[PDB]
Design a protein around this motif. Sequence first.
Motif, PDB file in Angstrom:
ATOM      1  N   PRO A  13      -3.887  -7.806  -9.642  1.00 38.05           N
ATOM      2  CA  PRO A  13      -3.620  -8.882 -10.522  1.00 38.05           C
ATOM      3  C   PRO A  13      -2.957  -8.534 -12.017  1.00 38.05           C
ATOM      4  CG  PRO A  13      -5.432  -9.501  -9.216  1.00 38.05           C
ATOM      5  CD  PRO A  13      -5.352  -7.848  -9.326  1.00 38.05           C
ATOM      6  N   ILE A  14      -2.032  -9.089 -12.509  1.00 37.22           N
ATOM      7  CA  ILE A  14      -1.748  -8.940 -13.896  1.00 37.22           C
ATOM      8  C   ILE A  14      -2.953  -9.053 -14.775  1.00 37.22           C
ATOM      9  CG2 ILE A  14      -1.173 -11.330 -14.309  1.00 37.22           C
ATOM     10  CD1 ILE A  14       1.420 -10.151 -15.845  1.00 37.22           C
ATOM     11  N   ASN A  15      -2.970  -8.099 -15.861  1.00 36.50           N
ATOM     12  CA  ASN A  15      -4.159  -8.241 -16.926  1.00 36.50           C
ATOM     13  C   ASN A  15      -5.587  -8.198 -16.228  1.00 36.50           C
ATOM     14  OD1 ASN A  15      -2.382 -10.637 -18.751  1.00 36.50           O
ATOM     15  ND2 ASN A  15      -2.216  -8.588 -18.837  1.00 36.50           N
ATOM     16  N   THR A  16      -5.682  -7.205 -15.205  1.00 34.16           N
ATOM     17  CA  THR A  16      -7.135  -7.150 -14.606  1.00 34.16           C
ATOM     18  C   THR A  16      -7.171  -5.573 -14.866  1.00 34.16           C
ATOM     19  OG1 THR A  16      -6.653  -8.964 -13.235  1.00 34.16           O
ATOM     20  CG2 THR A  16      -8.149  -7.414 -12.367  1.00 34.16           C
ATOM     21  N   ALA A  17      -8.678  -5.313 -15.167  1.00 30.83           N
ATOM     22  CA  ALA A  17      -9.188  -4.026 -15.440  1.00 30.83           C
ATOM     23  C   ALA A  17      -9.112  -3.312 -14.078  1.00 30.83           C
ATOM     24  CB  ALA A  17     -10.357  -4.145 -15.869  1.00 30.83           C
ATOM     25  N   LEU A  18      -8.573  -1.912 -14.099  1.00 30.81           N
ATOM     26  CA  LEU A  18      -8.556  -1.205 -12.749  1.00 30.81           C
ATOM     27  C   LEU A  18     -10.135  -0.943 -12.196  1.00 30.81           C
ATOM     28  CD1 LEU A  18      -5.351   0.792 -14.118  1.00 30.81           C
ATOM     29  CD2 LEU A  18      -5.920  -0.723 -11.984  1.00 30.81           C
ATOM     30  N   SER A  19     -10.396  -1.069 -11.083  1.00 30.54           N
ATOM     31  CA  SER A  19     -11.599  -0.528 -10.606  1.00 30.54           C
ATOM     32  C   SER A  19     -11.452   0.637  -9.702  1.00 30.54           C
ATOM     33  CB  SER A  19     -12.666  -1.473  -9.941  1.00 30.54           C
ATOM     34  OG  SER A  19     -11.747  -1.908  -8.974  1.00 30.54           O
ATOM     35  N   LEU A  20     -12.395   1.502  -9.280  1.00 30.67           N
ATOM     36  CA  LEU A  20     -12.189   2.630  -8.355  1.00 30.67           C
ATOM     37  C   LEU A  20     -11.590   1.927  -6.808  1.00 30.67           C
ATOM     38  CD1 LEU A  20     -15.152   5.098  -9.039  1.00 30.67           C
ATOM     39  CD2 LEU A  20     -12.542   5.349  -9.502  1.00 30.67           C
ATOM     40  N   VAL A  21     -12.294   0.939  -6.386  1.00 31.19           N
ATOM     41  CA  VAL A  21     -11.634   0.287  -5.161  1.00 31.19           C
ATOM     42  C   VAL A  21     -10.160  -0.024  -5.166  1.00 31.19           C
ATOM     43  CG1 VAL A  21     -13.997  -0.645  -4.389  1.00 31.19           C
ATOM     44  CG2 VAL A  21     -12.264  -1.974  -5.656  1.00 31.19           C
ATOM     45  N   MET A  22      -9.592  -0.272  -6.225  1.00 29.67           N
ATOM     46  CA  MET A  22      -8.049  -0.401  -6.556  1.00 29.67           C
ATOM     47  C   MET A  22      -7.353   0.750  -6.175  1.00 29.67           C
ATOM     48  SD  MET A  22      -8.299  -3.256  -9.553  1.00 29.67           S
ATOM     49  CE  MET A  22      -9.348  -4.493  -9.562  1.00 29.67           C
ATOM     50  N   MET A  23      -7.610   2.080  -6.434  1.00 27.73           N
ATOM     51  CA  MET A  23      -6.775   3.222  -6.538  1.00 27.73           C
ATOM     52  C   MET A  23      -6.943   4.245  -5.556  1.00 27.73           C
ATOM     53  SD  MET A  23      -6.918   3.722 -10.672  1.00 27.73           S
ATOM     54  CE  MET A  23      -8.712   3.404 -11.069  1.00 27.73           C
ATOM     55  N   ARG A  24      -5.829   4.448  -4.679  1.00 27.41           N
ATOM     56  CA  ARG A  24      -6.001   5.473  -3.704  1.00 27.41           C
ATOM     57  C   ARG A  24      -5.136   6.801  -4.241  1.00 27.41           C
ATOM     58  NH1 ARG A  24      -3.779   1.826   0.508  1.00 27.41           N
ATOM     59  NH2 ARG A  24      -1.684   2.334   0.662  1.00 27.41           N
ATOM     60  N   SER A  25      -5.190   7.924  -3.500  1.00 27.13           N
ATOM     61  CA  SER A  25      -3.894   8.675  -3.934  1.00 27.13           C
ATOM     62  C   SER A  25      -3.310   9.148  -2.670  1.00 27.13           C
ATOM     63  CB  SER A  25      -4.528  10.013  -4.487  1.00 27.13           C
ATOM     64  OG  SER A  25      -5.083  10.871  -3.727  1.00 27.13           O
ATOM     65  N   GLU A  26      -1.884   9.517  -2.849  1.00 22.94           N
ATOM     66  CA  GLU A  26      -0.953   9.672  -1.903  1.00 22.94           C
ATOM     67  C   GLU A  26       0.063  10.472  -2.193  1.00 22.94           C
ATOM     68  OE1 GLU A  26      -0.111   5.579  -0.126  1.00 22.94           O
ATOM     69  OE2 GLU A  26       1.367   6.614   0.973  1.00 22.94           O
ATOM     70  N   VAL A  27       1.012  11.372  -1.423  1.00 27.57           N
ATOM     71  CA  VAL A  27       1.987  11.951  -1.969  1.00 27.57           C
ATOM     72  C   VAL A  27       3.199  10.841  -1.559  1.00 27.57           C
ATOM     73  CG1 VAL A  27       3.582  14.041  -1.454  1.00 27.57           C
ATOM     74  CG2 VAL A  27       0.891  14.113  -1.334  1.00 27.57           C
ATOM     75  N   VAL A  28       3.747  10.807  -2.660  1.00 27.27           N
ATOM     76  CA  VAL A  28       4.812   9.619  -2.475  1.00 27.27           C
ATOM     77  C   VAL A  28       5.871  10.170  -3.578  1.00 27.27           C
ATOM     78  CG1 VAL A  28       3.367   7.595  -2.085  1.00 27.27           C
ATOM     79  CG2 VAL A  28       3.759   8.195  -4.590  1.00 27.27           C
ATOM     80  N   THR A  29       7.382   9.228  -3.538  1.00 28.86           N
ATOM     81  CA  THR A  29       8.371   9.599  -4.128  1.00 28.86           C
ATOM     82  C   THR A  29       8.980   8.753  -4.559  1.00 28.86           C
ATOM     83  OG1 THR A  29       8.580  11.470  -2.463  1.00 28.86           O
ATOM     84  CG2 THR A  29      10.363  11.293  -4.182  1.00 28.86           C
ATOM     85  N   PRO A  30       9.275   8.311  -5.904  1.00 26.18           N
ATOM     86  CA  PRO A  30       9.196   9.240  -7.101  1.00 26.18           C
ATOM     87  C   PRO A  30       7.583   9.313  -7.353  1.00 26.18           C
ATOM     88  CG  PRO A  30       9.832   7.339  -7.900  1.00 26.18           C
ATOM     89  CD  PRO A  30       9.934   7.042  -6.337  1.00 26.18           C
ATOM     90  N   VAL A  31       7.371  10.367  -8.114  1.00 28.67           N
ATOM     91  CA  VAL A  31       5.995  10.698  -8.823  1.00 28.67           C
ATOM     92  C   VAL A  31       5.661   9.754  -9.723  1.00 28.67           C
ATOM     93  CG1 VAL A  31       4.702  12.558  -9.617  1.00 28.67           C
ATOM     94  CG2 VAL A  31       6.008  13.034  -7.756  1.00 28.67           C
ATOM     95  N   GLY A  32       4.231   9.235  -9.561  1.00 31.12           N
ATOM     96  CA  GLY A  32       3.866   8.284 -10.707  1.00 31.12           C
ATOM     97  C   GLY A  32       2.667   8.969 -11.509  1.00 31.12           C
ATOM     98  N   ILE A  33       1.580   8.104 -11.514  1.00 33.73           N
ATOM     99  CA  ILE A  33       0.781   8.796 -12.415  1.00 33.73           C
ATOM    100  C   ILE A  33      -0.112   9.718 -11.709  1.00 33.73           C
ATOM    101  CG2 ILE A  33      -1.815   8.122 -13.409  1.00 33.73           C
ATOM    102  CD1 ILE A  33      -0.410   5.485 -14.348  1.00 33.73           C
ATOM    103  N   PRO A  34      -0.273  10.961 -11.974  1.00 37.32           N
ATOM    104  CA  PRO A  34      -1.261  12.014 -11.249  1.00 37.32           C
ATOM    105  C   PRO A  34      -2.421  11.385 -10.617  1.00 37.32           C
ATOM    106  CG  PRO A  34      -0.391  12.914 -13.341  1.00 37.32           C
ATOM    107  CD  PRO A  34      -0.270  11.441 -13.435  1.00 37.32           C
ATOM    108  N   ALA A  35      -2.757  11.599  -9.386  1.00 33.50           N
ATOM    109  CA  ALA A  35      -4.138  11.311  -8.919  1.00 33.50           C
ATOM    110  C   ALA A  35      -5.221  11.848  -9.690  1.00 33.50           C
ATOM    111  CB  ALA A  35      -4.321  11.835  -7.380  1.00 33.50           C
ATOM    112  N   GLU A  36      -5.478  12.768 -10.233  1.00 32.56           N
ATOM    113  CA  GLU A  36      -6.490  13.329 -11.173  1.00 32.56           C
ATOM    114  C   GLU A  36      -6.578  12.486 -12.317  1.00 32.56           C
ATOM    115  OE1 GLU A  36      -4.993  16.880 -13.499  1.00 32.56           O
ATOM    116  OE2 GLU A  36      -3.568  15.896 -14.362  1.00 32.56           O
TER     117      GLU A  36
END
Length: 66
Positions: A13-36
Amino acid sequence: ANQASVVANQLIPINTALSLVMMRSEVVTPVGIPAEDIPRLVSMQVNRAVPLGTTLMPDMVKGYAA
């Protein structure tokens, strides 16, 4: 080539603090923020709703610079 990016594991959701359950990593194109950078993104807010499966881009996270 196999550079992985941060991908929304659920709709964030807009204006919501990111938590670890919300982010996975994947090889996608175009490249976005680095998984690290996932641990550093914890508690930062998005400035727009991010649908499931969207690549997180630098411009979407308030206060991000890396």
